[PDB]
Amino acid sequence: KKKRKNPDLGFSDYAAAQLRQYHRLTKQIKPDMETYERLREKHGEEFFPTSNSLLHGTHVPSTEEIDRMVIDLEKQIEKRDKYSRRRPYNDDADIDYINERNAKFNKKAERFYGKYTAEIKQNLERGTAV
Amino acid sequence: AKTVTKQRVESHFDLELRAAVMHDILDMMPEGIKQNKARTILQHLSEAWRCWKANIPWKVPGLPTPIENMILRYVKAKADWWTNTAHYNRERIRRGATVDKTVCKKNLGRL
Amino acid sequence: LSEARARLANTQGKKAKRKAREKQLEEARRLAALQKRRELRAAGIEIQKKRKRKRGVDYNAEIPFEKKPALGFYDTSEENYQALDADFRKLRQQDLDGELRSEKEGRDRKKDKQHLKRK
Amino acid sequence: WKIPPCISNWKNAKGYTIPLDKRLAADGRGLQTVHINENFAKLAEALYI
Amino acid sequence: VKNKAPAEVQITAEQLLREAKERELELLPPPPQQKITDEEELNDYKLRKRKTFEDNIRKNRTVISNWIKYAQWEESLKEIQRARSIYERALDVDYRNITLWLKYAEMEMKNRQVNHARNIWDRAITTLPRVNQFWYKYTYMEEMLGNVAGARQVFERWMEWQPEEQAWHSYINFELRYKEVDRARTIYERFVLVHPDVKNWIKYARFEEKHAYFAHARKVYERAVEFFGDEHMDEHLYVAFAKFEE
Amino acid sequence: TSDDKSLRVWEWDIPVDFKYIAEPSMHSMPAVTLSPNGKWLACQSMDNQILIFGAQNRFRLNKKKIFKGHMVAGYACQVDFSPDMSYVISGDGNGKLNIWDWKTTKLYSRFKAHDKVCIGAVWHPHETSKVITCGWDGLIKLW
RNA sequence: UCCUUGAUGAUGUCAUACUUAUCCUGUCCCU
RNA sequence: AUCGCUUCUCGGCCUUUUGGCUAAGAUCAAGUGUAGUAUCUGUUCUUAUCAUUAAUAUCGUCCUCUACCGAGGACAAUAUUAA
Ligand SMILES: [Mg+2]
């Protein structure tokens, strides 16, 4: 029995998120050795190419290969589409906005200036006192 | 290529100051910053100039100190411009030289 | 209090307000002209219309400011794409553009309201 | 290197409604700290004497 | 008869805000469900939408999202030659914007155009070669398509640039994923020759441990402790070599 | 009723129009029909609804009665009311008749009769047993 | 040899009250 | 312990969001009329959908063929018995 924990830190980079996404996708894939050793025996010496080998303009993927690629890419697109999970909308909070963009601007304002404007909120709720 | 004559002077100054700040914030951000956020800093520059004219102390509670120092720099530049223009126009209105009525009211409002 | 609520809700100038009405009227006149043209095509009458503008017909006629894709090192002349199935007996203007975000989030906040209020 | 949104005392282009604590987050007029001198005391006392 | 009397409710400002938001005096109704018949009306719809997007492109000019929305709309209707034109125009505007290359290549992958997408990846890694996103996705497309030798060649083109630690580990993991502990050993030799660091020799030695090559691992150890010298080394190298011989 | 979305009411043989009704909201009125009581009008507005306008001197549309179970994006159509004003039958592009309860204001019944879009629907004025429809497919049907 | 889903008198008419292609420039009442 | 589905909770992205300038750019209180339009209040009529079976046989439109006519095929309910 094995065990692994993989949380995430903050954003920091569009390349670190790429690399995390790549490690996920690249651990998920499983090779089939039959096609591999078939192509190995067929191609022989040129199966371990350098940068300048010759085979750049030759490969033609059979229908199952491109089907596997498109299925994988659709799964990847769906996992990317779930990137911002929608927080649930309670209506018990005293609303503070006259619009739909106004609400999101007030949310950004509470993100940035919520740590500082905490005494004045207490004054406004206790009756503009202290 | 329209010339900056007399009715375009202030608008062109504010058109060029804003471009200078655009260049400086594109060069000031480090290597892996998301390259948005120019509009927000320009709004802060506008607010620092309005607090300068209002003699209101301007202080944004969290703001990176290179951005805060750069906005203070360009606000001091526009302040020197505004004040030296007010000196020149007041000396003109005093000596009797030809001035517009609009620049008379503008000079009163600056003074 | 009524004027207070009406002036708190407002965020638009005169010009935005007239453009909103103009867009509504454009939608109305487009539906009316569509009704007339669909009736003419239904009964069968080939009345044509004019068009007087420089650009604008360049969009459906061909590709607007076409750049061919730069090509190289892999033969890309045989392969081609399969076009869209029409299905002109179920299809809606809403069906092509997809559900706009305010409808989906309205359905979601309705579901949230129900599951909060019943619990 | 994150930039906070500008909440202005003057301009409200899209006519939003901003909470009062946010709207009055002008800290400089709250930390301005009008501090009195100690030479008013000598003046007041000498004048009463 | 009106009665002055002190109340109970005492209306507040947040109640005014709640009642002002519910007036909805800017929320226009959605357009009516309009069923379109034969392709005259479909072309009229397309005319309206293309005019809207081309007008947004005229004003913004830059603003890369406008191009992306218009290209996604063209790919949704399987008119992907239009979208090839739109992405090529957008790359004429801004060729250094990496997600634009990504969306163009993922359209050509998604629509079963393996060969167009493959051309796009080749052009992408040519023009923006220090963007590692491009190389990962192109060597991953060549692995999902089954072109093993093609992914070998793209990895070799990528190792020509001397990228970073993670690129070489991804190439080694590719090799080890298939078979080929000898070729992964060659890539490990190149990697320790192009990134000399104590942690890299430790990782390569740990590799030779985990594939049971204790004589090879000891030769790596003897080649590492001699290469670093005498005056520089931190603990970790001799700690790992001590733990190995333990 | 006109292509421009307005109604013009007139006395007979006199050119001027006494009452003009327009609201920026209403999309159009391609077909309008008058109740057997002479009390209510029914327009099939393009906007996918039916509007009731009081026949009575006050030509003011009333909020209480509305109909929106059916879609005509932009089709001419006939709306009729079952004699006795019990029901309203709309014919639509999709081809399905929409029967509403006037009293209760709710789509009581619906048919997918016709395979092509259907226009005029008539309730036999004397017999309650049936209605007659027509539409593009070229057939007259009796329901 | 089909086909798809529900929110407690109503509806209509008459009367009363509130805003002009359309303009004029200000005062009451008790100790 | 592991994998998948569902309910609930939470963190991160959420500049995706306030897209110029000046003398805050300037200024700052009120009915006079009508008819016409809109809204509200009563005055009047709400609870349900309507109308035999089994067996047997066979004028109108459309298509094809032959010289308006004839033939063939298909579709549209009809007749009889019995409670
Ligand atoms: Mg205004």
Coordinates of N, CA, C and O (backbone and C1' of nucleotides) in Angstrom, one line a residue, chain H residues 17-47:
Chain H
rU17 P -11.7 43.4 -17.0 O5' -12.1 44.4 -15.8 C5' -11.3 45.6 -15.5 C4' -11.5 46.1 -14.2 C3' -10.7 45.5 -13.0 O3' -10.7 46.4 -12.0 C1' -13.0 45.1 -12.7
rU18 P -9.5 47.5 -11.8 O5' -10.2 48.7 -11.0 C5' -10.6 49.9 -11.7 C4' -11.8 49.7 -12.5 C3' -12.0 50.8 -13.6 O3' -12.7 50.3 -14.7 C1' -13.7 51.0 -12.0
rG19 P -12.0 50.1 -16.1 O5' -11.2 51.4 -16.3 C5' -9.8 51.4 -16.5 C4' -9.3 52.4 -17.5 C3' -10.2 53.7 -17.6 O3' -9.4 54.8 -17.9 C1' -10.0 52.6 -19.7
rG20 P -9.3 56.0 -16.8 O5' -9.1 57.3 -17.8 C5' -8.7 58.5 -17.3 C4' -7.6 59.1 -18.1 C3' -7.4 60.6 -17.9 O3' -6.5 60.8 -16.8 C1' -7.6 60.2 -20.2
rC21 P -6.9 61.8 -15.7 O5' -6.7 63.2 -16.4 C5' -5.5 63.6 -16.9 C4' -5.6 64.9 -17.7 C3' -6.3 66.0 -16.9 O3' -5.4 66.7 -16.1 C1' -7.2 65.9 -19.1
rU22 P -5.8 67.3 -14.7 O5' -6.3 68.7 -15.1 C5' -5.5 69.7 -15.8 C4' -6.3 70.9 -16.2 C3' -6.9 71.6 -15.0 O3' -6.8 73.0 -15.1 C1' -8.5 71.1 -16.6
rA23 P -6.1 73.9 -13.9 O5' -7.1 75.0 -13.5 C5' -7.3 75.4 -12.2 C4' -8.8 75.7 -12.0 C3' -9.7 74.5 -12.0 O3' -9.9 73.9 -10.8 C1' -10.5 76.3 -13.4
rA24 P -9.3 72.5 -10.4 O5' -10.6 71.5 -10.4 C5' -11.3 71.3 -9.2 C4' -11.7 69.9 -9.0 C3' -12.6 69.3 -10.1 O3' -12.2 68.1 -10.6 C1' -13.6 69.2 -7.9
rG25 P -12.5 67.8 -12.2 O5' -12.8 69.2 -12.8 C5' -11.8 69.9 -13.5 C4' -12.4 71.1 -14.3 C3' -13.7 71.8 -13.6 O3' -13.3 72.7 -12.6 C1' -14.1 71.4 -15.9
rA26 P -14.4 72.9 -11.4 O5' -15.6 73.8 -12.1 C5' -15.4 75.1 -12.5 C4' -16.6 75.6 -13.1 C3' -17.9 75.7 -12.3 O3' -17.9 76.8 -11.4 C1' -18.4 74.8 -14.4
rU27 P -18.6 76.6 -9.9 O5' -20.2 76.6 -10.3 C5' -20.8 77.7 -10.8 C4' -22.2 77.3 -11.2 C3' -23.1 76.8 -10.1 O3' -23.7 77.8 -9.4 C1' -23.3 75.3 -12.0
rC28 P -24.0 77.7 -7.8 O5' -25.6 77.4 -7.8 C5' -26.2 77.2 -9.1 C4' -27.4 76.2 -9.0 C3' -27.9 76.0 -7.5 O3' -29.3 75.8 -7.6 C1' -27.2 73.9 -8.5
rA29 P -30.1 76.3 -6.3 O5' -31.3 77.2 -6.9 C5' -32.4 77.6 -6.2 C4' -33.6 76.7 -6.5 C3' -34.6 76.4 -5.3 O3' -35.8 77.2 -5.2 C1' -34.2 74.5 -6.6
rA30 P -36.6 77.6 -6.5 O5' -38.1 77.7 -6.0 C5' -38.7 76.6 -5.4 C4' -39.9 76.1 -6.1 C3' -40.1 74.5 -6.2 O3' -41.5 74.6 -6.4 C1' -40.0 75.4 -8.4
rG31 P -42.3 73.4 -7.1 O5' -43.7 74.0 -7.5 C5' -44.4 74.9 -6.6 C4' -45.0 76.0 -7.5 C3' -46.3 75.7 -8.2 O3' -46.9 77.0 -8.5 C1' -44.7 76.1 -9.8
rU32 P -48.1 77.2 -9.6 O5' -47.4 77.5 -11.0 C5' -47.4 78.8 -11.6 C4' -48.3 78.8 -12.9 C3' -49.5 78.0 -12.7 O3' -50.6 78.5 -13.6 C1' -48.2 77.0 -14.3
rG33 P -52.1 78.7 -13.1 O5' -53.0 78.0 -14.2 C5' -53.2 76.6 -14.1 C4' -52.9 75.9 -15.4 C3' -53.3 74.5 -15.7 O3' -54.6 74.4 -16.3 C1' -51.1 75.0 -16.6
rU34 P -55.7 73.2 -15.8 O5' -56.2 72.7 -17.2 C5' -55.8 73.4 -18.5 C4' -55.4 72.3 -19.5 C3' -56.1 71.0 -19.4 O3' -57.1 70.9 -20.4 C1' -53.8 70.7 -19.4
rA35 P -58.1 69.7 -20.4 O5' -57.4 68.6 -21.4 C5' -56.7 69.0 -22.5 C4' -55.7 68.0 -22.9 C3' -56.2 66.6 -23.0 O3' -55.3 66.0 -23.8 C1' -54.8 66.8 -21.1
rG36 P -55.7 64.9 -24.7 O5' -54.6 63.8 -24.6 C5' -53.3 64.2 -24.3 C4' -52.6 63.1 -23.4 C3' -53.1 61.7 -23.5 O3' -52.1 60.8 -23.3 C1' -53.3 62.4 -21.4
rU37 P -52.0 59.4 -24.1 O5' -51.1 58.6 -23.1 C5' -50.1 59.3 -22.3 C4' -50.0 58.6 -21.0 C3' -50.3 57.1 -21.0 O3' -49.5 56.5 -20.0 C1' -51.6 58.2 -19.5
rA38 P -49.0 55.0 -20.3 O5' -48.7 54.6 -18.7 C5' -48.3 55.7 -17.8 C4' -48.9 55.3 -16.4 C3' -49.1 53.8 -16.2 O3' -48.9 53.6 -14.8 C1' -51.1 54.9 -15.9
rU39 P -48.2 52.2 -14.3 O5' -48.8 52.2 -12.8 C5' -49.0 53.5 -12.2 C4' -50.2 53.3 -11.2 C3' -50.5 51.9 -10.7 O3' -51.1 52.0 -9.4 C1' -52.4 52.7 -11.8
rC40 P -50.7 50.9 -8.3 O5' -51.9 51.2 -7.3 C5' -52.6 52.5 -7.3 C4' -54.1 52.3 -7.1 C3' -54.5 51.0 -6.4 O3' -55.7 51.3 -5.6 C1' -55.5 51.1 -8.4
rU41 P -55.9 50.5 -4.2 O5' -57.5 50.7 -4.2 C5' -58.1 51.9 -4.8 C4' -59.5 51.5 -5.3 C3' -60.1 50.3 -4.6 O3' -61.5 50.5 -4.7 C1' -59.9 49.8 -6.8
rG42 P -62.4 50.5 -3.3 O5' -63.9 50.7 -3.8 C5' -64.8 49.6 -4.1 C4' -64.7 49.2 -5.5 C3' -65.8 48.2 -6.0 O3' -66.9 48.9 -6.5 C1' -63.7 47.4 -6.7
rU43 P -68.4 48.5 -5.9 O5' -69.1 48.0 -7.2 C5' -68.7 48.4 -8.5 C4' -68.9 47.4 -9.6 C3' -69.9 46.3 -9.2 O3' -70.4 45.8 -10.4 C1' -67.8 45.3 -9.5
rU44 P -71.7 44.8 -10.4 O5' -71.2 43.5 -11.1 C5' -70.5 43.6 -12.4 C4' -70.1 42.2 -12.9 C3' -71.0 41.0 -12.6 O3' -70.9 40.0 -13.6 C1' -69.0 40.8 -11.3
rC45 P -72.1 39.1 -13.9 O5' -71.4 37.7 -14.2 C5' -70.0 37.6 -14.8 C4' -69.1 36.8 -13.9 C3' -69.2 35.3 -14.1 O3' -67.9 34.7 -13.9 C1' -69.7 35.9 -11.8
rU46 P -67.7 33.2 -14.2 O5' -67.8 32.5 -12.7 C5' -66.6 32.1 -11.9 C4' -66.4 30.6 -12.0 C3' -66.7 29.8 -10.8 O3' -66.8 28.4 -11.2 C1' -64.4 29.7 -11.0
rU47 P -67.7 27.3 -10.3 O5' -66.7 26.6 -9.3 C5' -66.5 25.2 -9.3 C4' -65.4 24.9 -10.3 C3' -65.1 23.4 -10.4 O3' -66.0 22.7 -11.2 C1' -63.1 24.7 -10.5

